Design a protein around this ligand. Structure first.
Ligand SMILES: [Zn+2]
Ligand SMILES: [Zn+2]
Lengths: 265, 268
């Protein structure tokens, strides 16, 4: 028996990587079901046959997954934002982070097009990224002067998936590895060759979960007077309080309220 | 207005006054003479009978025989020792966990296993760890694997009734469980109490003989019953059921390996 990640799917043959060695595996004889469809990202236990073939015994229960593209067990969603063309937007970035955590994904932030960004504007984005760093995210600000392969190689261990709108430069990263979805090797893991549905979407989300996905509202929410305080019109609200003494950025709370209202309608 | 003689647990010990919890009510008790005359040696966790004096104080009558204890810190009558290990920072070690379980059972403590930092752990490593925890489960331990997402107060509340002591080394996430509650003190929870402790160490080559080690590998204990050899240490003895169960996969190699290393280490 061997364990590894499915990196490639084609006509019901699943290619599992085990310590850099590829095995062309299939489902064992019995399996056809609603719970019988492996995806790229799946961790499987398989029995070796014919040197580099095998028969999948179990698919481990997925920690997470996306439907478009179909990919499971994502270790880090990199949210890719351009500094210009279009302008860096905390409204958009806050939306993306919320959707990331709605799918249970760890996220980090990558800003592109530094070399096309006026330095005064660069310094504005820097102070904004420090508020995201306060909240708990890793942030990077790059342009054409930075080695993209080494950026990708240095990201945390495991499966990287890139997410972000068209034209932010995701393919500039994905073409150091590439030329449906396939995983490619990094020194300490993998990267998917297809972005996470680009401008990512929420799937099902209720108005009461949004505060969970603002990680600082989540934290500061723990002592709000009301049990399930939405931090909107509740008295004795510690989010309102931490906002008032400046440990929550106003744009974060503004975006929270906008999204809360959007989801209710 | 209540009864005269009461039984409960010492939750706090400060300068010769022993605070005793009787059904959620605290009584500050001591021996009924000069503190000098050293009559009782009570420890946090002790079950004691006292006579009620001046409303919410008392005279200790009797400390019941300890079912178990630690000397460091000094705490008796532990219902569950929770061994807290990180998945990462530092890396999960079946070597260290096996050692901790041996110390635990050497003090006749029931143990369970808590792994932290799931959220900092690459998913492929998480599944490796889930696969190792299933082996400890087959051996008969309760196991949990948590990160930041999980509700601590809730987990710490859902553990078996009575006194929980968390044990594990520096920087593993233990402080985080206790902050929903706050030498040593017990804090009330629904269904019992909880306390802290800084992990084990010089407790192996402290009171354990080479011949006891196999008692505290719970599956070696159980399989050892039908070894032909008297006092079988499962090393080179023939007609060894441990060696046999191992050969057919009922004992994990890493368990037998850790047993062998520890045995050789205590032969010094
Ligand atoms: Zn609130
Ligand atoms: Zn034996």
């Amino acid at each position: 028996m061997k364990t590894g990640r499915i990196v490639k799917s084609i006509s019901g043959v699943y290619q599992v990587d085990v310590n850099g060695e590829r095995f062309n595996t299939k489902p064992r004889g019995l399996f056809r079901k609603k719970k019988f469809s492996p995806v790229v990202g799946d961790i499987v236990e398989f029995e070796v046959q014919n040197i580099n073939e095998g028969y999948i015994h179990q698919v481990f229960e997925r920690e997470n997954e996306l439907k478009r593209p179909p990919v499971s067990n994502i270790d880090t969603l990199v949210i890719v934002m351009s500094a210009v063309e279009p302008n860096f937007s905390t409204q958009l970035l806050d939306r993306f982070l919320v959707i990331a955590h709605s799918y249970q994904l760890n996220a980090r932030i990558l800003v592109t097009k530094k070399d096309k960004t006026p330095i005064e504007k660069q310094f504005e984005i820097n102070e904004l990224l420090k508020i995201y760093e306060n909240i708990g995210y890793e942030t990077e600000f790059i342009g054409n002067d930075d080695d993209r392969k080494k950026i990708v190689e240095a990201w945390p261990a495991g499966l990287i998936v890139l997410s972000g709108q068209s034209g932010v430069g995701k393919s500039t990263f994905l073409n150091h590895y590439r030329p449906h979805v396939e995983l490619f090797e990094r020194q300490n893991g993998y990267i998917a060759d297809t972005p996470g549905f680009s401008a990512l979407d929420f799937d099902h989300i209720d108005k009461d979960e949004i505060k969970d996905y603002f990680l600082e509202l989540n934290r500061y929410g723990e002592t709000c007077k009301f049990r399930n305080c939405n931090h909107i019109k509740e008295p004795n609200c510690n989010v309102k309080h931490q906002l008032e003494i400046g440990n929550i950025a106003q744009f974060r709370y503004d975006h929270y309220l906008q999204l809360f209202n959007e989801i209710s309608n």
